[PDB]
Amino acid sequence: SKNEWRKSAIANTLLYLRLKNIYVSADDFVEEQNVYVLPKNLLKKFIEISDVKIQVAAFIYGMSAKDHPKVKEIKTVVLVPQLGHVGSVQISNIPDIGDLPDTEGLELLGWIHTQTEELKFMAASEVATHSKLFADKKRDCIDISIFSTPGSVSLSAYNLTDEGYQWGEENKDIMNVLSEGFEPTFSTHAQLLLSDRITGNFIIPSGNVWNYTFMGTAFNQEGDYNFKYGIPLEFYNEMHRPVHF
């Protein structure tokens, strides 16, 4: 019904309020370890297009600053076709963006996603998703989880251990209710800074559509999609509805 769609879209218009209180998971600084810097404009928009119940995700790309190879600045967030769930997200493959202009020197840094449970480590479903995406391409990729809740957003960045990559490919299964031998220790702390001194941008699917949640049959997780620079649409945008009548 066009009714229930409408109420969910309304709740999402209040997401921005959560950016008043921002928490970032941090520990004693380590010099040899990389530092990831996330443009605030990117976090703000990404929250604004997300959902109150269903996980939303995207890839992150960027590069080392000129003086400091340990400081990885996030330049670009890529929203790709996906099917989100409460508790997990089915994300399509690493996108091919090298043919796009202005992407010279861009490094794939990992992925970013929302969640509605608070944790101090990558959940079982993150481990499976992160394994499937990165095990054979770039194991140093990070996972930035945003715990989104009324009143605040809490960010934590993780690296995934070799052991974690291994379990994640054993248990690639989509049910993921067994969780035999899942360990919090599969993930380790990555250093993350929020910054409003730098600006980032978005690359989106060329036809604007990234949320396949109400178009499930039409979603191909293995799909080779087309990409362009743009302003990502919100979760319940009309283009994310099945076109009717």
């Binding site: 409408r6 109420k7 309304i10 709740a11 218009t13 209040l14 309020l17 941090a26 520990d27 004693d28 600084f29 009324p150 009143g151």
Partner: protein, 252 residues
């Protein structure tokens, strides 16, 4: 001093203004992992309300006001006092209040010192803890404050058109119920206001155009919101509550 007893007196025929300076000096905070804390000031406002008519004099305090100054918290009270004094003096004599009630005691002396030219205007504190700080959770007020590029006075009626139909006391009670709810759980309170998309806010209003019938249900949802969160902060069963002073909850 105004309390929940002599509280009725608010609605007699003497012109009175409430002054809330809570949002005059406002900041955002940056706290490093070390523990070092930096503040940055954002635009603020003096909230000056006539509870009988609903007329709101919102005096926007631009950040430039703080540039080069020291003891900003102290300064903020004295600046609020100059502005309120200036406002009173701008009004025709028959529109000037007979009482000004300050929501925070620390405003008493500065304001009384600035109003010495008006010995017949009583400056009073209150033992109510009114929810006027939540005024910045009203979209249209937050917007005008944040877009300001210099100090500016903006005028609203915070009761919209309610007084065509209800008494001032009923309107003031609706208003404080709404603000208390917005103060208590902003996202949930706004959800209650946005539930029915067919009911809209007129361009000249602050609140949705509920019918008399709908307001009863909205008010009751706001009341539930408040008492529920009050029964979480302290794990008291509101079932076990008497009618008690739920009104004292609402007011402070």
């Amino acid at each position: 001093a105004m309390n929940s007893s002599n509280y009725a007196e608010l609605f007699n025929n003497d012109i009175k203004l409430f002054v809330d300076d809570t949002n005059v000096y406002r900041v955002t905070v940056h706290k490093t992992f070390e523990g070092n804390v930096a503040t940055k000031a954002i635009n603020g406002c003096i909230f000056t309300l006539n509870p009988k008519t609903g007329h709101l004099f919102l005096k926007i305090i631009h950040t430039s006001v703080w540039a080069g100054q020291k003891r900003l918290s102290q300064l903020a009270k004295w600046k609020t006092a100059e502005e309120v004094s200036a406002l009173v003096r701008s009004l025709p004599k028959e529109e000037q209040p007979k009482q000004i009630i300050v929501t925070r005691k620390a405003m008493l002396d500065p304001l009384e010192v600035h109003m010495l030219d008006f010995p017949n205007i009583a400056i009073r504190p209150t033992e109510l803890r009114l929810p006027f700080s939540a005024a910045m959770s009203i979209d249209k007020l937050s917007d005008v404050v944040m877009k300001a590029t210099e100090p500016q006075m903006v005028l609203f009626n915070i009761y919209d058109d309610w007084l065509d139909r209800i008494s001032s006391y009923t309107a003031f009670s609706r208003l404080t119920l709404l603000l208390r709810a917005l103060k208590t759980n902003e996202e949930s309170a706004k959800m209650i206001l946005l539930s029915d998309p067919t009911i809209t806010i007129k361009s000249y209003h602050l609140w949705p155009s509920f019918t008399d019938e709908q307001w009863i249900t909205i008010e009751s949802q706001m009341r539930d919101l408040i008492l529920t969160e009050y029964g979480r902060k302290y794990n008291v069963n509101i079932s076990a509550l008497t009618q008690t002073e739920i009104k004292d909850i609402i007011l402070g």
